[PDB]
Design a protein around this ligand. Structure first.
Ligand code: LJA
Length: 171
């Protein structure tokens, strides 16, 4: 059985219990913490591409009011985010299972942009999600996995200084 697990859940949970925030810029900003995933149960000899996308966790705009994150009242449908291909893709199962799969080079933006960067809507709450796509074989296969522990609100600057302080302490 294909097993997908979050590396450093300990750290992610400190961020989550404060409400995590991720900066988005016109040019694209890398994530901290970085999503790193432990994968076992692949065919070491099969081929796999690793994809990352961001699910809108709810349909609302959030705002930091009197030191607390609060949803707007006016939901709008959230079109799914674009997919980021792990730059090591494609590679053999053995490659993916030899060390944590680390999405250190994904950049989050607030503007439709050339390539690489993933455009998110500022002040929306997102749940990272990967897809493991078996490629080259005759039978194409997709396994998806969500990471609740890694939820964040996309922000153009940090609102909760407790987050600013954790980001610096652990970077
Ligand atoms: C929509 C999309 O990009 N999907 C996808 C699927 C398998 C492989 C790749 N590319 C690759 N370089 O591994 C991309």
């Amino acid at each position: 059985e294909l097993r997908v697990g979050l590396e450093e859940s300990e750290l992610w949970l400190r961020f989550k219990e404060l409400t995590n925030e991720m900066i988005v810029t016109k040019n694209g900003r890398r994530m901290f913490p970085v999503l790193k995933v432990n994968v076992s149960g692949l065919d070491p000899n099969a081929m796999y591409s690793f994809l990352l996308d961001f699910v809108a966790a709810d349909n609302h705009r959030w705002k930091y009011v009197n030191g607390e994150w609060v949803p707007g009242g006016k939901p709008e449908p959230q079109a799914p985010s674009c997919v980021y291909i792990h730059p090591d893709s494609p590679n053999f199962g053995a490659h993916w299972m030899k060390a944590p799969v680390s999405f250190s080079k994904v950049k989050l933006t607030n503007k439709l942009n050339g390539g690489g960067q993933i455009m998110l809507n500022s002040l929306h709450k997102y749940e990272p999600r990967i897809h493991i796509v078996r490629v080259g074989g005759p039978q194409r296969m997709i396994t998806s996995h969500c990471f609740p522990e890694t939820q964040f609100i996309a922000v153009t600057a940090y609102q909760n200084e407790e987050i600013t302080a954790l980001k610096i302490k652990y970077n």
